[PDB]
Design an enzyme around this catalytic site. Structure first.
Site, PDB file in Angstrom:
ATOM      1  N   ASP A   1      44.477  47.214  37.108  1.00 39.08           N
ATOM      2  CA  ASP A   1      43.338  46.264  37.240  1.00 39.08           C
ATOM      3  C   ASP A   1      43.218  45.321  36.327  1.00 39.08           C
ATOM      4  O   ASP A   1      43.009  45.961  35.000  1.00 39.08           O
ATOM      5  CB  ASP A   1      41.867  46.797  37.605  1.00 39.08           C
ATOM      6  CG  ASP A   1      40.807  45.923  37.847  1.00 39.08           C
ATOM      7  OD1 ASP A   1      40.625  45.064  36.972  1.00 39.08           O
ATOM      8  OD2 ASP A   1      40.188  45.995  38.998  1.00 39.08           O
TER       9      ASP A   1
ATOM     10  N   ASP B   1      43.571  40.566  41.451  1.00 40.49           N
ATOM     11  CA  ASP B   1      43.733  41.081  40.109  1.00 40.49           C
ATOM     12  C   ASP B   1      43.852  42.522  40.389  1.00 40.49           C
ATOM     13  O   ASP B   1      43.721  43.333  39.096  1.00 40.49           O
ATOM     14  CB  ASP B   1      42.181  40.804  39.390  1.00 40.49           C
ATOM     15  CG  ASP B   1      41.059  41.606  39.435  1.00 40.49           C
ATOM     16  OD1 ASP B   1      40.759  42.147  40.461  1.00 40.49           O
ATOM     17  OD2 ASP B   1      40.409  42.084  38.542  1.00 40.49           O
ATOM     18  N   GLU B   2      44.235  43.180  41.322  1.00 37.70           N
ATOM     19  CA  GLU B   2      44.722  44.541  41.571  1.00 37.70           C
ATOM     20  C   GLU B   2      45.989  44.986  41.976  1.00 37.70           C
ATOM     21  O   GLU B   2      46.435  44.190  42.878  1.00 37.70           O
ATOM     22  CB  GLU B   2      43.756  45.283  42.365  1.00 37.70           C
ATOM     23  CG  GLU B   2      42.132  45.154  41.867  1.00 37.70           C
ATOM     24  CD  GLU B   2      41.065  45.973  42.646  1.00 37.70           C
ATOM     25  OE1 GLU B   2      41.443  47.232  43.158  1.00 37.70           O
ATOM     26  OE2 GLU B   2      39.913  45.764  42.835  1.00 37.70           O
TER      27      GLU B   2
HETATM   28  N1  LIG Z   1      30.871  39.581  43.005  1.00 32.85           N
HETATM   29  C1  LIG Z   1      32.098  39.248  42.480  1.00 32.85           C
HETATM   30  C2  LIG Z   1      32.844  40.355  42.059  1.00 32.85           C
HETATM   31  C3  LIG Z   1      34.028  39.669  41.412  1.00 32.85           C
HETATM   32  N2  LIG Z   1      34.250  38.288  41.432  1.00 32.85           N
HETATM   33  C4  LIG Z   1      35.655  37.743  40.707  1.00 32.85           C
HETATM   34  C5  LIG Z   1      35.759  37.606  39.463  1.00 32.85           C
HETATM   35  C6  LIG Z   1      36.391  38.710  38.770  1.00 32.85           C
HETATM   36  O1  LIG Z   1      36.853  38.265  37.477  1.00 32.85           O
HETATM   37  C7  LIG Z   1      37.318  39.109  39.963  1.00 32.85           C
HETATM   38  C8  LIG Z   1      37.725  40.777  39.835  1.00 32.85           C
HETATM   39  O2  LIG Z   1      36.836  41.654  39.982  1.00 32.85           O
HETATM   40  P1  LIG Z   1      36.664  42.773  39.367  1.00 32.85           P
HETATM   41  O3  LIG Z   1      38.022  43.243  38.837  1.00 32.85           O
HETATM   42  O4  LIG Z   1      35.566  43.385  40.217  1.00 32.85           O
HETATM   43  N3  LIG Z   1      35.955  42.396  37.853  1.00 32.85           N
HETATM   44  P2  LIG Z   1      36.592  41.615  36.529  1.00 32.85           P
HETATM   45  O5  LIG Z   1      37.869  41.750  36.520  1.00 32.85           O
HETATM   46  O6  LIG Z   1      35.824  40.440  36.154  1.00 32.85           O
HETATM   47  O7  LIG Z   1      36.018  43.002  35.399  1.00 32.85           O
HETATM   48  P3  LIG Z   1      36.537  44.620  35.236  1.00 32.85           P
HETATM   49  O8  LIG Z   1      37.777  44.652  36.480  1.00 32.85           O
HETATM   50  O9  LIG Z   1      37.252  44.645  33.669  1.00 32.85           O
HETATM   51  O10 LIG Z   1      35.710  45.316  35.314  1.00 32.85           O
HETATM   52  O11 LIG Z   1      36.630  38.866  41.058  1.00 32.85           O
HETATM   53  C9  LIG Z   1      33.404  37.279  42.072  1.00 32.85           C
HETATM   54  O12 LIG Z   1      33.731  36.090  42.084  1.00 32.85           O
HETATM   55  N4  LIG Z   1      32.242  37.705  42.717  1.00 32.85           N
HETATM   56 MG   LIG Z   2      39.313  44.063  40.848  1.00 39.45          MG
HETATM   57 MG   LIG Z   3      39.205  43.640  37.167  1.00 41.13          MG
END
Ligand SMILES: Nc1ccn([C@H]2C[C@H](O)[C@@H](COP(=O)(O)NP(=O)(O)OP(=O)(O)O)O2)c(=O)n1
Ligand SMILES: [Mg+2]
Ligand SMILES: [Mg+2]
Length: 347
Positions: free
Chosen positions: A9, A107-108
């Site tokens: 992730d 992102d996963e």
């Molecule tokens: N409600 C949301 C949740 C995530 N996203 C987008 C932005 C994030 O950078 C992306 C990845 O989601 P995520 O992996 O849950 N969080 P992110 O990568 O920013 O932080 P962590 O994974 O390190 O916690 O999806 C969005 O646009 N609206």
């Molecule tokens: Mg994610």
């Molecule tokens: Mg993430």
DNA sequence: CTGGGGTCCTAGG
DNA sequence: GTCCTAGGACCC
């Protein structure tokens, strides 16, 4: 000789991409959303950097709220094409490790690895973190287990910039006292329904009589929730390509619409845009949904199936407007949306 | 004040 | 045991 599932992730994904072009901002609060102007109404945060999250900013927060909760943040506009490009590089690198790789959104990803004795899944995860960082400038976290759900749960303990192993040896010790919504796909409403029956933790769920859960949730879901509580999950990592089931676009307007002329024209424009994108991806539409949200935040969605699967623009527009016409549109309209469900018969 | 993009499932006329 | 829409519940 030992079968492992690794779940990768990416760390603070949208912010980390932005940080490549703004390396002076590393270590500082950065908040991605809207157009980078924090006073702009009707825009929210898409991603806060870890530093900004310490001030309580989090995805979905109004930008004006966020700026008020982290006044020294640098506000950057959301750049989707850059996140898409960065995703593809990440998947393209992970694929070249020679393990099965199942991508999930941008992102996963899950990776399946059968390890001889000399190796160690922890050291496979470190070479993942190292290859990604060196080649892409992105940090990631890696949870490790023997099934996808439990690996994904481990990844929340691995954050930030880390690795964590969660197996049958520590599943009870680590997450037993946590509420059921620490599990994937259990959220607040299942939690409430669980609490009603006296179930308030994972360990409590793990020892619940199956017929209480099968009566309350269905004969396959009820058993699935048991499985989840006991740390089990899906064990197969398929490299098969994801086929989207739908595509959609919604627009919240800078000011609410009151002319029906403009509501029609917006739905027509969303239907056309979405259709051209699915036709470019070689898809065929099966059903057409319209969503309407008023100035009240009163929001509904209606859908209609085409007589047969089609790509016809005039037909899909008429269908969307027809569905639009089934709403009473006697209130100002904050948002309109369209979603096209897609055929999954022959690829 | 309160975004945009998804999936999967059940209730039900 | 049909074929349909509504919409709840989650999640990124
Ligand atoms: N409600 C949301 C949740 C995530 N996203 C987008 C932005 C994030 O950078 C992306 C990845 O989601 P995520 O992996 O849950 N969080 P992110 O990568 O920013 O932080 P962590 O994974 O390190 O916690 O999806 C969005 O646009 N609206
Ligand atoms: Mg994610
Ligand atoms: Mg993430």
């Amino acid at each position: 000789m030992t079968k492992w599932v690794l779940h990768v992730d990416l760390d603070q994904f949208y912010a980390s991409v932005e940080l490549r072009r703004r390396p002076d901002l590393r270590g500082q609060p950065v908040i991605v959303g809207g157009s980078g102007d924090p006073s702009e109404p009707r825009k929210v945060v898409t991603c806060a950097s870890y530093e900004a999250r310490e001030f309580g900013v989090h995805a979905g927060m109004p930008l004006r709220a966020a700026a008020r909760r982290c006044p020294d943040a640098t506000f950057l506009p959301s750049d989707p094409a850059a996140y898409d490009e960065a995703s593809e590089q990440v998947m393209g690198l992970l694929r070249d490790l020679g393990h099965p790789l199942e991508v999930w959104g941008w992102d996963e990803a899950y990776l399946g690895a059968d390890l001889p004795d000399e190796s160690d899944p922890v050291e496979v995860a470190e070479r993942i973190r190292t290859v990604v960082a060196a080649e892409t400038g992105l940090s990631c976290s890696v949870g490790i287990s023997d099934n996808k759900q439990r690996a994904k749960v481990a990844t929340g303990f691995a954050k930030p910039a880390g690795i964590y192993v969660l197996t049958e040896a520590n599943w009870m010790t680590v997450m037993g006292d946590r509420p059921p919504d620490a599990l994937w796909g259990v959220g607040p409403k299942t939690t409430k329904k669980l609490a009603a029956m006296g179930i308030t933790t994972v360990a409590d769920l793990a020892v619940t009589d199956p017929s209480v859960l099968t009566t309350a949730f269905g004969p396959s879901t009820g058993l699935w929730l048991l499985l989840l509580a006991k740390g089990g999950g899906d064990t197969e990592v398929s490299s098969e390509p994801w086929v989207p089931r739908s595509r959609s676009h919604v627009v919240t307007f800078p000011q609410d619409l009151t002319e029906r002329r403009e509501m029609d024209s917006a739905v027509r424009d969303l239907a056309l845009q979405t259709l051209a994108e699915i036709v470019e991806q070689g898809r065929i539409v099966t059903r057409v949904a319209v969503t309407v949200r008023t100035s009240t935040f009163y929001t509904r969605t209606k859908i209609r199936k085409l007589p047969a699967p089609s790509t016809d623009a005039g037909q899909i527009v008429d269908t969307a407007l027809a569905v639009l016409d089934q709403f009473e549109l006697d209130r100002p309209v904050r948002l309109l949306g369209v979603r096209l469900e897609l055929a999954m018969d022959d690829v």
